């Protein structure tokens, strides 16, 4: 009957994030128990699906405050839902507006493949609304965009940049496409995090989606659509993961704490086991889910690595030194800092530490994001920035023809990510870094996914 | 308005189509019969999903997503090596996608578990089955009968299939409402799902599976719907109350808005139908069709007496209520509506079961749109014999629905109604969907 003292190198992460990012990622997603391959479609195991559940609960609650109703439309065409053609059957009068719908979807197809990120398999939501006028639709587009900011920032501890897509990168049926953009600094790649579209009257004209207004004048509806996918999980993994494995923001971890007993003598086993159970009770009585790993066949050291790999935010260790001192050792996953905590203070310190882990994960990620943006004047400064795994903020004329030319001259190509909502001042005579006719606004450009 | 034009008792299938479309539950895409679950239908699914998730989580079942039982079980040995890995408990909420220009219920739930022994597995099978009873009975106000399927009607891979059966008395047809299967070690042997037990002995896992679909919604509609349209148990209606003004014209609005705020402040969602271009009669029918549990009517006299009139959807009874008593009376009424819907459906279910001792009583019961509870020897070969004979006499077949968990006494000398060797247990038989 075998005792396992040492977690073998091969069962941990054998590639370093910075040195071999793609293999590092592959290893983390399987070894942390997020996903499992069947044969390259993958199963979302509970640790991944739990993250989706948490963001789904938050988003549902928030969209319901905006009177959005969930629904389910099963017919799709190549991916988009057959829906707008039905809207004339439901809308006659301003009293029928706004129409506000959302659905939670699941799709799998043959892969073409980085799980969560470049995949034909995902869970998502998409919302669709129709309003009596432009201002109400555009307000809603930006309200939803801020909810995406919160999904990322409050749940995944991922900072995003809000912006408007360039004409070449926006959805063809949209008047404008707003976006949340994320950036993975370790490989220099931007990735679109969520989208929120003002569709104007385009589909109303196609399907005769018209209503009688309050003045008895016929008008087109103004539409919106918006979506966010399990790509969000990938972004989170890539943002916080380290060389020991997965790191989970506490808000999307099922177990907040793992309790590990330390003892080598049978005379100590009962007191250790009992104290560990006291701590498990204290936390669970307080609605803090946790796991007490009391397996006899694995050493404490093995268990440390086992649960770090799984991304548990806090580990509490209990050894004989701790019984003697009425304490325990609390270890944070994010930065591996340890402290001794009195038994009576474990609840409060754990609560405070879960909040601080989230803050630290976010603030460190935001620093990396901010440090990844180089503001440039000229195309000659661009390649050095790209090669430093950066994206660039450049004054740009926003001429659609230039997007394919920028791509072509700089997969190694950089593309317009978004024109950020937050604009630095534009100096009086600033020229486009490409054109160079007068520059309109600053645009972010980068290599992408 | 065009309301419901066919009577439930007279043309059931036409009634049903009119109710599901007119009430805004579904919209058909086209003659394929593919359809949209509109918010009124999806809201029901949401409510039961919330309930079920909460309860299965108390049993440590975790949600997951396997792309679409062979993918699934072939992967289980990768996760199970010792007793420490058990029990494995998974659930999935599934959605179907139909691609328009590609070669080919839209929502359902399926769970799967694996356990160290028979006792633990079977206990979960029955715990889940009671959660399905509660899904039906607490949220949908639909009574069900728990039982075990016959050998001929169980899932072929199961050691036994437990079931919740419902009956629609207006058309005399039973319907399987949910199922929960003990799979034994059948698939474990097939996919080599073994573990090392506490004593270092290799054992097979004991598995269960269980599911329920949007058919549950259809069952609810068939059960409580009436000739005016949909009837919603309050727990699965987005709006609990509609407020309808009856023409003041300024004081009326203000008064209706006061009631709206009282209810909404107490977290009771409601709608104040203040549309100027429709009559109150129009509005009454509009909201009845849509299944809203309670209407509150406010007219001039009610202003004068500081009252209003509360009207129940289920029985159309009215009562006069003081303004300051509206919140409490509304809360009590929503409870009482659910209780009445359930009790009247339970009475119809009870009255649909004829207990028989011989085959010569069966066709009379079937032709009266009943089910029969009969003493049966349970021999699989009799199932098709009984199907054929009841079909023949109809000119339709009845089949075994379930062997109820709640068994009446079996006299020591009772014969099977068909065979009649010694009878074992009572079995429910009926026509089915
Ligand atoms: Cl297609
Ligand atoms: Cl937390
Ligand atoms: Cl079955």
From Swiss-Prot, chain A:
Source superkingdom: Eukaryota
GO MF assignments: Ala-tRNA(Pro) deacylase activity; ATP binding; proline-tRNA ligase activity
Main location: cytoplasm
Free-text note on domains in this protein's UniProt record: Consists of four domains: the N-terminal editing domain, the N-terminal catalytic domain, the anticodon-binding domain and the C-terminal extension. The first domain (about residues 1-163) is required for editing of incorrectly charged tRNA. When it is deleted the enzyme shows pronounced misacylation of tRNA(Pro) with alanine.
Protein name (database record): Proline--tRNA ligase
Signal peptide (residue range): none
Reactions the enzyme catalyzes: tRNA(Pro) + L-proline + ATP = L-prolyl-tRNA(Pro) + AMP + diphosphate
Function as written in the Swiss-Prot or TrEMBL entry: Catalyzes the attachment of proline to tRNA(Pro) in a two-step reaction: proline is first activated by ATP to form Pro-AMP and then transferred to the acceptor end of tRNA(Pro). Functions in trans to edit the amino acid moiety from incorrectly charged Ala-tRNA(Pro). Has no activity on correctly charged Pro-tRNA(Pro) or Ala-tRNA(Ala).
Gene Ontology process terms (BP): prolyl-tRNA aminoacylation; tRNA aminoacylation for protein translation
A GO cellular component annotation in the UniProt record: aminoacyl-tRNA synthetase multienzyme complex
Binding partners and assembly: Homodimer.
EC number, as in UniProt: 6.1.1.15
Localization per record: Cytoplasm
Source organism of the structure: Plasmodium falciparum (isolate 3D7)
Binding of ATP, residues: 109-112, 118-122, 192-194, 229-231
Activity regulation (UniProt): Inhibited by the quinazolinone-based compound febrifugine from the Chinese plant Dichroa febrifuga which is used to treat malaria-associated fever. Also inhibited by febrifugine derivatives such as halofuginone.
Record's keyword terms, sorted: Aminoacyl-tRNA synthetase, ATP-binding, Cytoplasm, Ligase, Nucleotide-binding, Protein biosynthesis
Positions bound to L-proline: 109, 197
Phylogenetic classification of the source organism: Eukaryota, Sar, Alveolata, Apicomplexa, Aconoidasida
Similarity field: Belongs to the class-II aminoacyl-tRNA synthetase family. ProS type 3 subfamily.
